[PDB]
């Protein structure tokens, strides 16, 4: 399946995207983590539900300087993303 997450809090300037990329690739997930102009981060990942939930657990924590307020999520269908890209 596809996970679409909107990450809110103190999540830019804290190495969050590369953190998400590493956790995604360790789980064989594909997708992306993109910085938004308001300070939030859009994260999309595709793969098995169990792997996506573990990944989502990581997104809710972030690296040690991050302060994740909330991760709003929706579940959808895989489009065929491959590899994990930051932007």
From Swiss-Prot:
SUPFAM superfamilies: Acylphosphatase/BLUF domain-like. Transmembrane segments: none annotated. InterPro entries: Acylphosphatase (IPR020456), Acylphosphatase-like_dom (IPR001792), Acylphosphatase-like_dom_sf (IPR036046). Keywords: Hydrolase. It is an enzyme of class 3 (hydrolase). The keyword Hydrolase applies. Its EC number is 3.6.1.7. Residues 2-87 form the Acylphosphatase-like domain. Pfam families: Acylphosphatase (PF00708). It catalyses: an acyl phosphate + H2O = a carboxylate + phosphate + H(+). It comes from the Bacteria. The active site is at 17, 35. The keyword Hydrolase applies. GO terms for molecular function: acylphosphatase activity. Belongs to the acylphosphatase family. This is Acylphosphatase. It comes from Thermus thermophilus (strain ATCC 27634 / DSM 579 / HB8). The gene is acyP.
